[PDB]
Amino acid sequence: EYDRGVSTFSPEGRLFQVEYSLEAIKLGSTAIGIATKEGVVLGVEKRATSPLLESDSIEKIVEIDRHIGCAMSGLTADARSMIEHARTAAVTHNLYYDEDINVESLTQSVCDLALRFGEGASGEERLMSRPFGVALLIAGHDADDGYQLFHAEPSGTFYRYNAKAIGSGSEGAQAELLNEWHSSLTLKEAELLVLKILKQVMEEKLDENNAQLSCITKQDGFKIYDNEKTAELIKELKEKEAAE
Amino acid sequence: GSDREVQRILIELLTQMDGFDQSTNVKVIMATNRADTLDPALLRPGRLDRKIEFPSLRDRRERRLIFGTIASKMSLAPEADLDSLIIRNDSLSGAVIAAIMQEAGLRAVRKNRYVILQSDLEEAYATQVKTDNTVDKFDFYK
Amino acid sequence: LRPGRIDRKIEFPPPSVAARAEILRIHSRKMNLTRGINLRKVAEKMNGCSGADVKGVCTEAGMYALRERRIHVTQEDFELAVGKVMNKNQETAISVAKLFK
Amino acid sequence: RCKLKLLRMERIKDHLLLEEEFVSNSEILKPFEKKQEEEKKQLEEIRGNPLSIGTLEEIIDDDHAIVTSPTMPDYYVSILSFVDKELLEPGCSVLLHHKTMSIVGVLQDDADPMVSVMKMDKSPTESYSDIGGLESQIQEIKESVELPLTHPELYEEMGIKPPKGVILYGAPGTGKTLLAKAVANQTSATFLRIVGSELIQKYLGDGPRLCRQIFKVAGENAPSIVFIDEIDAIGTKRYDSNSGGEREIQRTMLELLNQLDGFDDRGDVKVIMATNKIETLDPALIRPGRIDRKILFENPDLSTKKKILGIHTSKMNLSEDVNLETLVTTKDDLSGADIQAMCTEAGLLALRERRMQVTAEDFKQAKERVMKNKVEENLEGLYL
Amino acid sequence: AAPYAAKLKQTENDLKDIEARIKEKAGVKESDTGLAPSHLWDIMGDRQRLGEEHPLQVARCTKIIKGKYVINLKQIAKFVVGLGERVRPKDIEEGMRVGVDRSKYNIELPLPPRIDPSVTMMTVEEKPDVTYSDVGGCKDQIEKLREVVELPLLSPERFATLGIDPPKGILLYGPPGTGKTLCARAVANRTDATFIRVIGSELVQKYVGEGARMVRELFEMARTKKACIIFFDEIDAVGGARFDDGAGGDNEVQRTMLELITQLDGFDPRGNIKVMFATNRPNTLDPALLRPGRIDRKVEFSLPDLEGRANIFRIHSKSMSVERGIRWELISRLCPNSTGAELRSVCTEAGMFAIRARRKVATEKDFLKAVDKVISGYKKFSSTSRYMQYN
Amino acid sequence: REMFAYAKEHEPCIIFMDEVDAIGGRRFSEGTSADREIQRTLMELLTQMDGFDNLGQTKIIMATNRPDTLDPALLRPGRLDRKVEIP
Amino acid sequence: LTKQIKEIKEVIELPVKHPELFESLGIAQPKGVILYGPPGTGKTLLARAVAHHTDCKFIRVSGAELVQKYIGEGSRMVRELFVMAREHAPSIIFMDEIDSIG
Amino acid sequence: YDRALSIFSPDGHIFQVEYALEAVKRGTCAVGVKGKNCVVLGCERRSTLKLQDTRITPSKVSKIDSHVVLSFSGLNADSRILIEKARVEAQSHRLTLEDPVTVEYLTRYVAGVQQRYTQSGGVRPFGVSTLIAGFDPRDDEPKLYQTEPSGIYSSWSAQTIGRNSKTVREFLEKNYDRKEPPATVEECVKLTVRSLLEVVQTGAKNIEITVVKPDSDIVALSSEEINQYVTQIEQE
Amino acid sequence: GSRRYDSRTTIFSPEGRLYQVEYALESISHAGTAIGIMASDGIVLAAERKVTSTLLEQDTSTEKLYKLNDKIAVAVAGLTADAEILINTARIHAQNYLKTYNEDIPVEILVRRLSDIKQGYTQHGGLRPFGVSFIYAGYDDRYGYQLYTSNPSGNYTGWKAISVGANTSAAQTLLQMDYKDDMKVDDAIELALKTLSKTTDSSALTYDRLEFATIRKGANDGEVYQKIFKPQEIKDILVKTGIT
C-alpha cells in the first residue's frame, strides 16, 4: 500500500515504514544510558540465549573513537552499516582538522546516513530502499559543552537527552528515569542507577555475563569496564535493596 | 422457495427428456445464447448428445452466401458489389449481414431511391459493424 | 494429498495401441460392420489420447453409414472417420479449440 | 483374546433389559390407575384432532401470544395455563387447537437439519491413550477442559472462574483433530463439532447466523464442548467475491467473539480450536482470558514415537521377523500420522502377499514409501 | 489363530441386533410441558375457548378514513373494518395492528405496531448481575461514563438547572480486552433501565433490504421505550467508514451502515435513548457515526497502569482463595502495559499450579510462573500493547 | 407480454421502453434472486421481437442511459436495426 | 485399461466384501482414493463398475446444487449426504471434482 | 535497477530475513565444537542417493585459509558464491595488511556481503548460515563464530545450525561446557561424531569431520577414521 | 508504475525456496531423457531428442550434444534456446583458462562457473534463471574422468551414473541394478542404450533420434578422443544391443 514504496506519503501524512522502524527498537536487548557532568555511563543487555553462548566477546558497546562511545539497540543488521559510518566520520574530522569532533556534530552525520530511504528522491545517491531499524545512544565528551548524550533515531532525527533507554523494555525503563534522574548524581551513583533499571527489564538473573558497563571520561578516555567490575557493582545494588 | 420452483421445473424437463427417448420423434431441440448457463446434468449425454456449434468466423464462401441470399430479397443496382465486402470484415454474424442490408434500404430512402446503390450499401456497411481486436481494420500481423 | 488420508493413487494412461484397439472392438459389437474390417487396422491409423477418441471414430463411422444408407458400416467410413477425429485431436493439442462459445 | 465371557456378560444383561421392558408394558404399564385415566379426560377435551403447529413470534403477558402459522394466517392465541405460561419463548413450535386456537401445549425440540450438521451421528471410539503420547500437552486440555466439568470440586477450592477455552496448534499429524474428540467421548458432554470450511459459504450473512446458532445450542446445554475443527480454513478459503471474500471473513470472526464470551454471559462453553495458521485469528481472540493456556505441538520425539507405533501394532499381526525398534530409529522428530500411515500401508503390503502375517519387511517397505511423500513430493529432492 | 476368535464375531453381532430390539419395543416420543399445580384448568379453558369469543385474526391498518379503515389482513386480503365494542377512535392509529374477528372483519382489540419484528425478539436480553464495584480498572474513566449515561437518568434535576440537554452518546474504545464491555455490564446492573444488545454481523443477510428493515424496527422500539440503552456492539463490521468499490458487493453492506445513521438522528431527536458504541477500533469508524453530535463526549478506557493493573489484580486475587504474603504491586512490575484479561488469566493458571501440588489456596510463587507464561505467548503473537496501530 | 398483444390489436402503436437499465441486465446470478427476474423477463422480449411475431406496424423504441448496460441480444441489430446516439 | 481394475479391486471391493481380513491385518481401512488421468478414460465408469459387484448404490456427485433442492448448499449437505449413504449402505459417493464450477 | 527485493515490514522486520532463516533451517546440519587445542566442524552430507561419486562431490567444509575453515548450511548454490568472495578477502588482508586473515576479520566480511543485500534494493540476502572457525596467526586460542543470513554474527563455545539443531543443542548442554572444553583433539572429534549420529545417522558415508590444529595445520579425517570413532562410540 | 508490474521472482518463498527455480525443474522434465554413465575408460553421454518428425533433418541436428572444449562436452535437457547462451559462455571461459595458463581447464572449474551464472540470475537483476540441466562429460588428469550434473539453481553433484529429463526415476533404477565399478566403455555403451529403451519417448527407439557420444582413452598415447557418432554409426551399436 504505503509499504511497497520506500518513498510515499500515506493518508495520515507521514511515513509508515518509519513507524515500523520505531517498532524494530522493541525487538532490541535494552540499552540504558545515564548522563551526568562527571562522565556518562552506558550499559547494555547482551542477552544470553544458551550456556553455549560466548557472551564476554559479544557486546552492544562500541567505540566510535577515543572521546565518543556508543550503545546500539534494535535490528543489528542495520547497526553494522551505521557504526562503520560513524567510525569513518570521526576519523575524517581528525584527518581534516587535527581536532576532536563534537558529540552533536558526529551524531548529526549519522542521522544523514539514516535519511537515505527512497530510490528516486532528490539528487543525493540512495544506497537503500527503506529506513534503518536501530537507534543509538551516542555518548561522549567534547571540550565545548562537556559531557553529552544524544539519542539518534533511524528517522534521521536526533535529540540530546540526559538519560534515555531504548530497546524492548524501553517504556518500563523510561518510567523509572523520570523519577530517578537528578542533577546531583555522581559517576558511581549513576552506574548503580543503570543496573537498577536494567534489572527490571532483565528477563534473567542480572549478572556480569549478560550485562556490560562502559564509561566515557575526559581523563581516562573511553573505557569498557571488565566483568569483574560489573560483578562488583551488581552485588552492591542488592545491598541497597537490603536498605528498603 | 420461489427459486426452488424454478429448479423443480428443470427436474421435470429431465424426467420427460428421459421418458421421451427411443421413440420415432425428434428429441428436443433447444438453443442457447450463452453456453455458461448449462449444468453437468443437462449437458450430459442422454439429454444433450449432439452439439452443433455456431461460429461468427465461418469462411469466405459461406459469408459470401449470407450477402447473396439477403441480396436476392432486396433489389439493387448492378453497381453494388456483394463480393468485395467479404474480405473487408470477417467477424460478422448473419444477423449483422441482415443489418447491413436493412440499413442500406434506409439510406436509399433518404435519397428517395428504391434500388440499392453502392453509395447506400457501403455507407451502411461501415457503421454497426464495430471495431474489434480481431478484425483486419488493424492489421500488421500478416 | 497429505499422507494418512490417501492410501491409493490411481493413474489412467492415455491408451496403448493394444488398448486402443480393444476400445474400438467394444463399441463395434453394437455396430454392424461389413465382415473383414479389422479394428486393429483402425487403431494403428489413430494415435488418440483417450478412449473417447476411439469412441468417436465408431460414432462418426456410423453416421457416415447413415448418410450412405447401407446397414453395414463400410471400410471406407473408417478411413474417413479416423481422419475426422485425428484432425479434431490435433486441433485441441495446439492450445485448445473452444467447445462452448 | 478370551474376552468372550465379558461379551456374553454384557449380552446377557441386554437380553434381561429386552425381557423386563416388554413384559412390563403388557398389563402392568400405566393402564389401570386413575391419576392417568381421569387426568387425560380433560386433556383430550382441549386437544385435537389437528394440532396445527405455529411459530411463536412474541409473547404477550396476559396468557396470549401472536403466532404466525406455516399455513399463513396469524392468530392472537390464548394459553390454557397448565403447560406453564412462561416456559415458552420466541422460536418455539406450538400446538394449536383444531377449533379456536389456544396453546394446547408446546413442543421442546423440533429437529432441524441445520443442527444435524453440528450434532454427532457417530461415536468417537478412539479416546484417551489411542492418541497416546503428548502426555505433557494433555494436561492443558484435561486440567482445563475435561477436568473442570468432571470435578468442579477442585475449582471450588481456588474459587475464581474456571478455565475457558483452548487453542490447539502445531504441525500436521500430531493428533490435534482427534484429541478433542477423545476428551468429549469420556465426559459425555454435549459435543458439537463444526468444520471450518462450512462457516464459509458462497452465500453471505447466513454464514454468521450459522455460527451464532452453534453457541446457542451450547449455552442451552449446560455441559458443553464445541470443537471448531479447522479455523485456518477461513483465511485460505473463499468462493465468489460478492458473497465470500474479505467482507464475509471479517463478519464471521466478529460474530464468534460475541458468541464465545463477548457480552452474552452464556453457559460454560469450552472451545477447542484446531488451527496451524494462528494469524487468521483476531487480536481479541488470541489474548487469554477467553482461551487461557495456549497449546503448542511439536513433532513427537523417539520415545514418544514408540508409544505412537504401539497403538498401531496391537492391531497388527506380529512375527518373529518384526523389529519395531529400528522403525523408530530412521524417523527423526517426525509426525504421528507418518507412523500411522506406515502401519496401514504395511498391512496393504501384507494384503498383496495374501498372507496374514505382517513382518519387518512389510513395515520397512512402507517406511520408504512414507518418507517418499517428503522427498518426492519435493521435486528438488535433496536440498539444493 | 485362537479358538475364540471365531466366536467373538458372533457374540459381537448379538449385541448389534439386541440394541435395535430394545429401542423398538421401548418406543420413542416427545412429551408436552406441564405443571403439577394444574390438574384442573378447563374451568376457564372453555371461557377462553369453545366458541367464538375469540382468538383474533391479526390485521394492520394501512389507511385511516375519516368518519372505517382499510386493513390488510395477514392473509393478504384487504377489507373495510370499523370500530367494535371496546375501542376509541383515539385508540386506532395508522400502522397499528388490530385483531379483527375471523368471521366478519371488525376491530376487536387494538394491538401494538408491526409483527415484522420477530428476530428483534432475540436481541432483547435481560441484564446480568455485575456489581458496580467490580470495574475493568479503577480510574476516573468509568466516572465519565457515569456522567454521560448514568447520572442524568437518576436525577434530571441537576441537568435542568444547568439547562443543558444531557449527552446521550459515548464511544467505548481502546485496545482489545481492557474490559470495555466489563464496565458497561457493571452499568447495566446499575441503571435499572432495559438493555437491548445488538450484533453488527447479525444484521447482514442474503437479500439486502431485509437488513434495513431489521435495524429500523429495533430502533423505533427503543423510541417507544423511555429509559433504555441500546448498546451497539461489534459495529466494526457495519458501522466502519463507507467506501464505494465499483465492482464489489460492498454496496449491499454499505446499505445497513446508512440505516444506522438515519435512525440515530431521526426526523425527531432521541426519546430517552442513551447510546453506547463498543468498538475494538477507533481507527476505522464512519465520520457519519463519529460526528460529535450523536456520540458527544467519548471517554477512552485505555490500558491499565502499574497501579491500575495492581487494582484489577486485587479484585482477581480477592475472589481467589489465597494465602497472605502476596504482592500485587510486584505483578504489575513484571507485566508491561497489557490487558486486565491477562491478569484474569494469571489467577486461573495459578489455580492450575495449585491443583498439581494439591492446594486449596494460591500463593505468590504460582503467580510468578503464571505471569511468565502469558508474557511469552504475547511475544509469540501480535497485540501486546497494540491499539491496532494509529490514532 | 400483454402490452405487446394490446399494441398489435391497436393500429400503428408506438411502444416506448423508458430507461431500461436494470430491466435489461445480463446473466449475472452470482447476485441475489432478483437477477433471475431480470433474466426471465428478458427472454420474453426476444421471442416477441423475433419469432412468428415480426412487427411491421407496431414499433419498438428503446431508451437507455448507457448502451453496454444491455445484454447483447438487446444490442443485436435485426431487432434493433438502427442504433441512434443522441449526443 | 485393465491395470486400473486390479489396483482398485484391492482397496474398495475387499474391505466392504470382507472387512474381516482388514481387522486382523490391522490396516485402517482405505480412506480417499484419487482417480486421475485424461478426461475420457472412463474414470467414472470404473467407479460404476465396482459399485455393481460391491452392491453399492452409485451416487454420482458433481459438486452440484441441482440435485439439492431441500438443502441447497453443499456446505450443509455433507452430514445429511453421509447419512443417506449409511441408510442405503453399502454406498459409493463419487465426488468427482472438475474444478470448473463457477 | 534497484527495485527492492528486500523491503521493510509492518512488524519492523525485513521479509527476506525471516524467509532466509527458514531456508537455513531446511538445509543441512552443522555442529561446531571447539576444544582448547582444536576446532572441529562436522557437518551433514547429502549422499543418500546411490551412484553418487562421493569423492568428487562438493564438501560441506571448505578451507579458506591454511588455518581458517568454513562450513555451511542453507542453499548450496549461495554458499559457493560466498566461498569465492572470501578467498578474495583472504588475499586482500595479505595484500595490504600482511599476515593471513584472523577469524574475526573473516566473520565480519561474510556478514558484510549479507548486510549489503539487506539494506539495498535489487538484491536479496543469501539464505546461508556459516560456522567459521580457526586460529589467528601465532595464536593457539580456538575461535568459533557463527554468521547468519541477516548479516549478524555471534561468538559461540558450541553452536549448531540446521535441521534438529535443538536436539543436538540439548545433547551438548549435558556434555559440553563453556567452562572446560575438551582438552584433547580426539575427545572433541568424538563428541561431534556422537552428536551427528543422532539425527544424520547413517554411518561415515553421510558424516564428515574436519579438524584444524593451531598455527597453520589443516587436516582432514578420511571416511575410515570417521567409521572407527562411530563403532567405538556406538559400543560405549 | 515501474513496481506495479513487477512481481518479484528473485525472492524466496516462505519455504526458503525460489519460485522460478522450482518451476524450471518441471519444464526440464518436458525435454527428453539424457544420460551420463562414467565407466573408467571414458564417459558415455547418450541423449534422445525431444522432437522428431520425418521431414525433420536429424542427420545434422544438434540439439543435445555440444563440445565446450576438446575434452569436455555436455548433454542438454531443457530448452535448446536457454542452454545455447550458457554453451557459448562456456566456450569463452574454457579457452580463456587455456589462453592464460597454457593448460586445459579442469572439469570442476568450468562446472562451478556455469553454476554461478545461474545463481547470478536469481541473486540480482530481476532476471529469470535459464532452465537448463547439463550432464558434463569431462576429463582431467587429476581425477581422471569426472561426471557431473548441474541444475538450474546453480549447484553441481558428482555422480557415477545419472539421468535428467523425461523418466528420470525409471532410468535411475536401471542404472543402479546393472552398474559395476569395473565397467568398460563397451559395457556402459550397452547399458546406456538399454536404459533409453525403457525410457523411450515414442514406442520405438531409432538411431536417427539418438545422439550418442563418447570420450575414450583408447586413443593412443594417453590422449582423450571425443567421438560424436553419426546416426549411421549409432545404427551399428543399435544392432549390437539388438534393439534392432
Ligand SMILES: Nc1ncnc2c1ncn2[C@@H]1O[C@H](COP(=O)(O)OP(=O)(O)OP(=O)(O)O)[C@@H](O)[C@H]1O
Ligand atoms: N499420538 C498419536 N497416537 C496415535 N495416532 C496418532 C497420534 N498422533 C496422530 N495420530 C494419527 O495421525 C493422523 C492425523 O492426526 P489428526 O487427524 O488426529 O490431527 P492433525 O494433527 O490436525 O493432522 P491432519 O489433519 O493433517 O491429518 C490420525 O489418523 C491420528 O490417529
Ligand SMILES: Nc1ncnc2c1ncn2[C@@H]1O[C@H](COP(=O)(O)OP(=O)(O)OP(=O)(O)O)[C@@H](O)[C@H]1O
Ligand atoms: N480488567 C478486567 N478485569 C477482569 N476481567 C476482565 C478485564 N478485562 C477483561 N476481562 C475478561 O474478559 C472478558 C471479555 O472481555 P470484554 O468482552 O469485556 O472486552 P473488550 O474490552 O470489549 O474488548 P474487545 O475489543 O476484545 O471486544 C470479560 O468478561 C472478563 O472475563
Ligand SMILES: Nc1ncnc2c1ncn2[C@@H]1O[C@H](COP(=O)(O)OP(=O)(O)O)[C@@H](O)[C@H]1O
Ligand atoms: N477403458 C475404457 N474402455 C472402453 N471404453 C472406454 C474406456 N474409457 C472410456 N471409454 C469410452 O469413452 C467414452 C468417454 O469416457 P468417459 O466415461 O466420459 O470418461 P471420464 O469418466 O474419465 O470422464 C465412454 O462413454 C466410453 O465409450
Ligand SMILES: [Mg+2]
Ligand atoms: Mg485432522
Ligand SMILES: [Mg+2]
Ligand atoms: Mg466487543
Ligand SMILES: [Mg+2]
Ligand atoms: Mg471425470
